Amino acid sequence: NQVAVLYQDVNCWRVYSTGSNVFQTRAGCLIGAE
Amino acid sequence: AQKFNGLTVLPPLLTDEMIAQYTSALLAGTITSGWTFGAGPALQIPFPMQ
Numbered sequence A: 001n002q003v004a005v006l007y008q009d010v011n012c013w014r015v016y017s018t019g020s021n022v023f024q025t026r027a028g029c030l031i032g033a034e
Numbered sequence B: 001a002q003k004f005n006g007l008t009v010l011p012p013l014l015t016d017e018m019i020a021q022y023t024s025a026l027l028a029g030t031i032t033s034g035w036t037f038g039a040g041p042a043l044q045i046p047f048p049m050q
């Protein structure tokens, strides 16, 4: 039941609720994976 | 620029650097092993005889 979220075009830091395990890719920013 | 209204572009799955690798692989096989690598393992053969 674990998931992950991808944000389309953000410089991840307009995101509101973020903890650890952040990562920025060419497509966007992804939180929930290492 | 300025993204106008709510329209996006999205990126392709395979980047251009990876595509160039695939074409280079085909050149190596046909120069060295002829057409043998299209079916089963590759076998070497001298070019003038090929």
Ligand SMILES: *[C@@H]1O[C@H](CO)[C@@H](O)[C@H](O)[C@H]1NC(C)=O
Pocket (backbone or CB within 6 Å): A011
């Ligand atoms: C994103 O933020 C970093 C640090 O705030 C900045 O250096 C960069 O220019 C910004 N934009 C992109 C596309 O990385």
